[PDB]
Amino acid sequence: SMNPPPPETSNPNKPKRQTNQLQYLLRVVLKTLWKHQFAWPFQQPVDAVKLNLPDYYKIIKTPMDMGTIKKRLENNYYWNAQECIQDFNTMFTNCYIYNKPGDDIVLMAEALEKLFLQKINELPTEE
Residues that bind ligand 2RJ (CB under 6 A): 41-42, 46, 51, 53, 65, 91, 94-95, 98-99, 104-105
- Kindly give the residue spans of alpha helices, DSSP state H, lying in the chain: 20-24, 31-34, 56-59, 66-74, 81-98, 104-120
Nearest approach in angstroms of CB 13 to ligand 2RJ is 28
Would you call 51 exposed, middle or buried from its count of C-beta atoms within 10 A (0-12, 13-18, 19+)?
Answer: exposed
| C-beta closer to ligand 2RJ: residue 21 or 65 | 65
| C-beta closer to ligand 2RJ: residue 26 or 95 | 95
Nearest approach in angstroms of CB 108 to ligand 2RJ is 6
Nearest approach in angstroms of CB 71 to ligand 2RJ is 15
CB distance 16 to 78 below 8 Å:
yes
